[PDB]
Amino acid sequence: MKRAVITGLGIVSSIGNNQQEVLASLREGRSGITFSQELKDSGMRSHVWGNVKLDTTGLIDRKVVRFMSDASIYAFLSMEQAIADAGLSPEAYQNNPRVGLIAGSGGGSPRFQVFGADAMRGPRGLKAVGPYVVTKAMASGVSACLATPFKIHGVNYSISSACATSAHCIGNAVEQIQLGKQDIVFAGGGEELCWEMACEFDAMGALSTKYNDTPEKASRTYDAHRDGFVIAGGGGMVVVEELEHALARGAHIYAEIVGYGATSDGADMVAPSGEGAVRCMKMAMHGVDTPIDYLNSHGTSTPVGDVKELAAIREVFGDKSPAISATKAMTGHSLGAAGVQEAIYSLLMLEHGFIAPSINIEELDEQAAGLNIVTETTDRELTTVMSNSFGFGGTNATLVMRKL
Amino acid sequence: MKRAVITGLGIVSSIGNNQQEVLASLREGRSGITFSQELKDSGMRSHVWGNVKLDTTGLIDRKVVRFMSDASIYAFLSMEQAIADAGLSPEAYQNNPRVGLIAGSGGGSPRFQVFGADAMRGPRGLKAVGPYVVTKAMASGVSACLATPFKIHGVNYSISSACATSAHCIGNAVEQIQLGKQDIVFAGGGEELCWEMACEFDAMGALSTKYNDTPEKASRTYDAHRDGFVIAGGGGMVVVEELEHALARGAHIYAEIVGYGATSDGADMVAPSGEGAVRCMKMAMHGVDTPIDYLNSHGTSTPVGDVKELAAIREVFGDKSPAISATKAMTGHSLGAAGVQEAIYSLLMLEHGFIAPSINIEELDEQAAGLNIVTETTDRELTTVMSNSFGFGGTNATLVMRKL
Ligand SMILES: [Cl-]
Numbered sequence: 001m002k003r004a005v006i007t008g009l010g011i012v013s014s015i016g017n018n019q020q021e022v023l024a025s026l027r028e029g030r031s032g033i034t035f036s037q038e039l040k041d042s043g044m045r046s047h048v049w050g051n052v053k054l055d056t057t058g059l060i061d062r063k064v065v066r067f068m069s070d071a072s073i074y075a076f077l078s079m080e081q082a083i084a085d086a087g088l089s090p091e092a093y094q095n096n097p098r099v100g101l102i103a104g105s106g107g108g109s110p111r112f113q114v115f116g117a118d119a120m121r122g123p124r125g126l127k128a129v130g131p132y133v134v135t136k137a138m139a140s141g142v143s144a145c146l147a148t149p150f151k152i153h154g155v156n157y158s159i160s161s162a163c164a165t166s167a168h169c170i171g172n173a174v175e176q177i178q179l180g181k182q183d184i185v186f187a188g189g190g191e192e193l194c195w196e197m198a199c200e201f202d203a204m205g206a207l208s209t210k211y212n213d214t215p216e217k218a219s220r221t222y223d224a225h226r227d228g229f230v231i232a233g234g235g236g237m238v239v240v241e242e243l244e245h246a247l248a249r250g251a252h253i254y255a256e257i258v259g260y261g262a263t264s265d266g267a268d269m270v271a272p273s274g275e276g277a278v279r280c281m282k283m284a285m286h287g288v289d290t291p292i293d294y295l296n297s298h299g300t301s302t303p304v305g306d307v308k309e310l311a312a313i314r315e316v317f318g319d320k321s322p323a324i325s326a327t328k329a330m331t332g333h334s335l336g337a338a339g340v341q342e343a344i345y346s347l348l349m350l351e352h353g354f355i356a357p358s359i360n361i362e363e364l365d366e367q368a369a370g371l372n373i374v375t376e377t378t379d380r381e382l383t384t385v386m387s388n389s390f391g392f393g394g395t396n397a398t399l400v401m402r403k404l
Numbered sequence: 405m406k407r408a409v410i411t412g413l414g415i416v417s418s419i420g421n422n423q424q425e426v427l428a429s430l431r432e433g434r435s436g437i438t439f440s441q442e443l444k445d446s447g448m449r450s451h452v453w454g455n456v457k458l459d460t461t462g463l464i465d466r467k468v469v470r471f472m473s474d475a476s477i478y479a480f481l482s483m484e485q486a487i488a489d490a491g492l493s494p495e496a497y498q499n500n501p502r503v504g505l506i507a508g509s510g511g512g513s514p515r516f517q518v519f520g521a522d523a524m525r526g527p528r529g530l531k532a533v534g535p536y537v538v539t540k541a542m543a544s545g546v547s548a549c550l551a552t553p554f555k556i557h558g559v560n561y562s563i564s565s566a567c568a569t570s571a572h573c574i575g576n577a578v579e580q581i582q583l584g585k586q587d588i589v590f591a592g593g594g595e596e597l598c599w600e601m602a603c604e605f606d607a608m609g610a611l612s613t614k615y616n617d618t619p620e621k622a623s624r625t626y627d628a629h630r631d632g633f634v635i636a637g638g639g640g641m642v643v644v645e646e647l648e649h650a651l652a653r654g655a656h657i658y659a660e661i662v663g664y665g666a667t668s669d670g671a672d673m674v675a676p677s678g679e680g681a682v683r684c685m686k687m688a689m690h691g692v693d694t695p696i697d698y699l700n701s702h703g704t705s706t707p708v709g710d711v712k713e714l715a716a717i718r719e720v721f722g723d724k725s726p727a728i729s730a731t732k733a734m735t736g737h738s739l740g741a742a743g744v745q746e747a748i749y750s751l752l753m754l755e756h757g758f759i760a761p762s763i764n765i766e767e768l769d770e771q772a773a774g775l776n777i778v779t780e781t782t783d784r785e786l787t788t789v790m791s792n793s794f795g796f797g798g799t800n801a802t803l804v805m806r807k808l
């Protein structure tokens with residue numbers, strides 16, 4: 001019944017350590033991609049990544065961070081930023097059964113799972129493992145590690161859905177508001193960056209391998225010579241809030257979440273059907289009586305995926321397609337964190353009135369023809385934006401956000 | 405404002421490879437716990453587990469199983485059973501936008517995360533890793549590995565929340581029905597059994613270590629001499645269905661889900677709070693006009709955890725305790741699979757009119773004074789049942805199920 005608005009955001013990304021830095025990078029078309037000695041050293045073919053360039057040392061209390069893997073660190077810092085941005089005091093949001101947290105990762109912590117197993121296999125066994133690995137390694141680490149220190153009393157769990165993870169978190173947070181169960185839900189995600197997980201993607205041929213000598217050019221969504229995604233890590237968090245509760249406190253409102261699509265392909269494991277995506281966008285658009293001014297695509301820089309989505313975009317919009325850009329060409333693919341980060345990039349475009357460029361397009365793919373792939377930063381007043389997240393395993397999420 | 409019912413179930417557990425074996429084990433008070441040479445060989449102090457005693461070879465299509473860790477296999481088989489049980493034709497549930505899947509795991513696949521890094525570090529590098537590790541290892545593996553082969557078109561994602569995982573999966577399925585978004589949601593979870601994960605629990609001292617010589621006595625929820633939980637693996641699935649839809653097709657209805665609590669402790673990371681559990685049970689009982697006849701407790705056989713739950717149950721029910729038993733004393737703790745397996749034990753009790761026994765109690769904990777802990781199989785006409793899932797990391801779920 002109830003309407004859901006976004007009233008604060010926070011982010012730790014390859015393109016910036018807070019919303020000010022991210023906004024600057026988006027406007028500049030600045031790449032967050034760097035060469036990775038770690039990835040090269042591990043024997044991988046992809047030697048490039050979207051790393052967080054924040055030194056996180058000392059930023060979280062000792063007794064809190066001892067439970068945390070990097071996904072949780074990134075998500076925690078993002079949540080601290082979001083609470084500050086929202087203007088929420090602990091009096092208001094802590095020990096409050098109407099305030100929840102839904103935040104996940106795509107992978108958990110392969111680094112800590114592998115650490116556990118390596119230590120256990122040495123001469124010291126359990127003593128080498130130590131008593132902290134479960135919270136770091138479990139799939140719910142990002143929710144568990146944040147709900148305790150922020151004193152959350154409402155919903156507390158992690159949704160995971162690969163590349164759609166934190167979009168489904170945001171949509172479920174919206175569902176909690178619509179059901180009348182929560183006044184606020186912090187929604188987002190985090191993802192560590194590590195050879196332990198990255199090598200799994202390289203093994204399936206998913207990562208870019210031909211551009212290691214020019215890291216900033218490797219991620220190139222829609223380019224005719226794209227060769228796979230560039231893996232990234234980071235975090236993000238948004239404050240999803242019931243509309244009346246927000247107005248009553250004088251909240252700063254970014255946008256209303258006016259649409260949330262969530263579908264399944266029920267077809268292929270590793271490649272999109274397009275059919276799932278068409279349904280997901282239409283669901284997100286249902287009852288949305290204003291056109292989409294800007295679409296932040298899923299667009300990971302993969303030969304098949306990039307154009308399946310564009311095909312889906314055509315079928316949905318017909319002869320009224322929106323301006324489109326793929327911010328992953330700058331940021332890389334942060335997996336479980338992508339949905340919330342890209343919702344944030346879309347909210348920054350909406351708030352500050354511009355479209356970020358789809359960079360590194362030297363030759364546009366023929367299946368992009370007739371669509372407005374925006375390749376230069378363009379100032380424009382936007383009203384309604386859409387953001388797609390199409391995960392491995394055929395799971396789809398689309399969010400539509402609109403000025404109030 | 406739509407109502408949700410369970411119309412089918414499926415289960416692979418330490419106490420039965422199907423609901424008949426499960427029902428029989430429940431009535432008999434039969435332990436599923438065995439000695440594990442794998443655990444011992446790994447260097448652990450805990451050498452007991454709730455293993456799935458089922459040779460799964462050739463049970464799943466070669467091109468479907470190749471994407472799967474054990475959690476997915478167990479969930480897949482459970483979902484096959486649940487579909488048969490619900491009387492669902494391929495034409496009824498497949499390729500249908502109003503039919504979804506919400507199913508998760510506590511840990512994903514520690515074994516395949518570790519396998520990936522091990523393979524990467526050896527002589528074949530990426531070729532050893534192979535192209536199937538992401539779908540085995542990622543947090544959403546269980547939902548991804550099932551949505552494709554079962555041709556699911558509606559919602560598709562995983563929830564993780566440790567011990568509460570598949571209970572939140574079921575609650576979220578209910579929400580999908582309440583919002584009018586889905587007609588059927590398959591809801592459940594799976595968990596592999598492996599030293600790779602088990603040793604992390606042992607390293608924090610959570611697992612039973614004193615009863616290795618008598619495996620069946622190890623899991624002893626509420627017993628004065630309990631000394632930790634017994635890890636288990638397995639799977640479960642329920643068919644969550646909108647009331648009218650179920651009636652319209654002449655479905656067999658086990659029960660209505662009349663309450664669903666989901667709360668967070670927001671307190672001490674390590675210990676269960678007590679209060680979060682009180683708030684969770686009260687949330688699940690809100691508006692329910694009938695007494696709780698039977699409560700399947702969370703109780704994992706840990707010194708602190710068991711007493712916190714006892715104390716919470718006494719706060720909620722005062723001097724009017726329901727009949728209570730901890731089926732984990734028979735089954736061990738299947739982590740991500742627990743919520744749905746225990747919802748199923750609960751539904752089988754409501755269906756077959758009996759209370760399963762709380763086994764291995766030689767001396768009842770004193771914190772259990774004033775409660776009705778049932779330690780012998782008891783025939784009784786139940787109408788309303790409750791199942792608690794109080795997850796590591798302070799994340800709570802409770803489900804209340806009632807005859808129509
Ligand atoms: Cl500005």
Ligand SMILES: [Cl-]
Pocket residue numbers: 756
């Ligand atoms: Cl019978």
